[PDB]
């Protein structure tokens, strides 16, 4: 009854290493995609200076 409950509690509490590392990598890329586009988002307002002169 300890094995059957230890296994029962592990499924509820312990994390799946495979299903979590794969999900961590996804959000670790989605933040770099937003990081990359944030840099370009700041460059866009810089083009009105050539028009203002």
């Amino acid at each position: 009854s300890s094995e059957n409950l230890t296994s029962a509690e592990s499924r509820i509490r312990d994390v799946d290493m495979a299903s979590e590392m794969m999900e961590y990598t996804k959000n670790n890329i989605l933040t770099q995609a937003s990081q990359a586009m944030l840099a370009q988002a700041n460059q866009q307002p810089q083009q009105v200076l050539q028009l203002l002169k």
Partner: protein, 55 residues
């Protein structure tokens, strides 16, 4: 071309501080090895677990 506000960059900032939070939450689980660290990850999971551990 409106200069005083960059809505394109302001919108990208929110998505930047929304995948960083998710990655931080994912790394908590990976380091500890537990799905339920805080009680907000699973209320019933937290309740059942503690009964289980006690048993």
């Amino acid at each position: 071309m409106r200069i005083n506000h960059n809505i394109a960059a302001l919108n990208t900032s929110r998505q930047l501080n929304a995948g960083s939070n998710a990655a931080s939450k994912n790394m908590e689980k990976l380091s500890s090895g537990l799905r339920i660290n805080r009680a907000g990850d699973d209320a019933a999971g937290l309740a059942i677990s503690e009964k289980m551990r006690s048993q």
